[PDB]
Design a protein around this nucleic acid. Sequence first.
DNA 1: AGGGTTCACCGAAAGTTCACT
DNA 2: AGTGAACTTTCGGTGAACCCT
Lengths: 79, 80
Amino acid sequence: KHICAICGDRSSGKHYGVYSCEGCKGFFKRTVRKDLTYTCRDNKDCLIDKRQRNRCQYCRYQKCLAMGMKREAVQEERQ
Amino acid sequence: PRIYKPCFVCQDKSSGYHYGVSACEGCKGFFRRSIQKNMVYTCHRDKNCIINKVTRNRCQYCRLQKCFEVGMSKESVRND
DNA sequence: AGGGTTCACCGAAAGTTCACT
DNA sequence: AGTGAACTTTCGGTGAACCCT
Ligand SMILES: [Cl-]
Ligand SMILES: [Zn+2]
Ligand SMILES: [Zn+2]
Ligand SMILES: [Zn+2]
Ligand SMILES: [Zn+2]
């Protein structure tokens, strides 16, 4: 019984060195490969949970880092 | 249940993010129209008119100026 | 165990509608 | 004839499910 360190949803295992869900793995993969920069609409303290995770992409990305997801663990696109 | 920053243009309650800014249903619609209808307004004052819920409909020129000013993206108003 | 891809789906943000002055 | 509250539609990010070693 594993839980995503970032949103609290059930975790598959460790992805980019962190116990995470399939959604936070995907978001981080997308963010790093595409070198995406986000802006928080509110005051950069958005609640990141199973429900509200897709609301602020800034706070979700800052939480991935805070929970320690390594950007170096993301490889370049295959072909 | 979800709370958004007041309409950037007139400062009334926001229905959400419309054309890049937190906007009220009035200012969303007004901006969509001035772009789709290619409206060109004129100020019947000195261009320094103030926009809030009670005055937003008094000067369409100064209301469109604020839409632009706060950052509404004309590019995101679909034209076929 | 943990890297990589995939594509139905859903909701944010777009358009649409229509009383009301 | 313009406005705006309340709808309906769109389409690209999301993520459950699938590769690979
Ligand atoms: Cl790193
Ligand atoms: Zn998660
Ligand atoms: Zn945020
Ligand atoms: Zn407004
Ligand atoms: Zn004016």
